[PDB]
Design a protein around this ligand. Structure first.
Ligand SMILES: CN(CCc1ccc(-c2ccccc2)cc1)c1nc(CN2CCc3ccc(C(=O)O)cc3C2)cs1
Ligand SMILES: CN(CCc1ccc(-c2ccccc2)cc1)c1nc(CN2CCc3ccc(C(=O)O)cc3C2)cs1
Lengths: 122, 136
């Protein structure tokens, strides 16, 4: 069983919060979900370094989610980003452009299929 | 000259056009601002549009001696750049405006170690004076 790191925006809306709960609930089927400002950073970074997969919900813009993704890239982690185009947002070119289709994947999704996409990934 | 990299949110770009312009103009006093212009033959020498932007931005980031980030507007792109910059062992300065009413992400505020990664709350009027102090 892999160690799984989930990230999402601390400022996510009602739709985002229900989706984060759904993503985390489904990730439990595959492995262990690991998830003072300095203390928060150090603890989250320790979890990120131990992760086998980093799964980020990137629909809401967030400095923290972007930061965890940049650190995860440099930690050589396998990354899956999930973006909901029905939010009307445009995903940052830095995240869409980070994708290489293998160790860094960015998938658009409709809210109803998020568990089926996670099953496909694992 | 020291190679300086400046980043800010793309979505704030029109509203914050003048503020990012003031930071960049003051950074010019202390080094070459790598991020001010993109040479087209460099992009041609290098992929879809987003990938091209990611690659050019990562080339600027690795060339940098100092990374200056305006972190007032939440952005996945700016956070990603800061994450990659930390791992490249870059000296980083983040500038945040508490007058915006926002709470800066604990991941950015908590990343500060006092020397190679600094986060400074500022009022817009002192931004040039703050850049002078950092670069002295
Ligand atoms: C369910 N969820 C996404 C929603 C969420 C829940 C909790 C906190 C959190 C904040 C502070 C301290 C502890 C937890 C932050 C976001 C998760 N995300 C993660 C990973 N990190 C945790 C840290 C962090 C900090 C800032 C920001 C940001 O948007 O700027 C994002 C994150 C995300 C763990 S659980
Ligand atoms: C003045 N300024 C902040 C506003 C700005 C200006 C230019 C472009 C840009 C876009 C594409 C190609 C080149 C430059 C992007 C944002 C600067 N920022 C930087 C660094 N990168 C460039 C890339 C990038 C992409 C997305 C996002 C995001 O907020 O999601 C942020 C950034 C920031 C260079 S000049």
């Amino acid at each position: 069983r892999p160690a799984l790191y989930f990230c999402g925006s601390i400022r996510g809306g009602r739709e985002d919060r229900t989706l984060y709960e759904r993503i985390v609930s489904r990730l439990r089927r595959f492995g262990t979900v690991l998830t003072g400002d300095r203390l928060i950073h150090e603890q989250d970074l320790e979890w990120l370094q131990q992760a086998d997969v980093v799964v980020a919900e990137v629909t809401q813009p967030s400095l923290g989610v972007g930061y965890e993704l940049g650190r995860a890239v440099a930690f050589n982690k396998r990354i899956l980003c999930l973006f909901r185009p029905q939010s009307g947002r445009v995903l940052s070119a830095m995240i869409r452009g980070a994708a290489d289709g293998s160790r860094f994947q960015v998938w658009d999704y409709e809210e109803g299929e998020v568990e089926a996409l996670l099953d496909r990934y694992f």
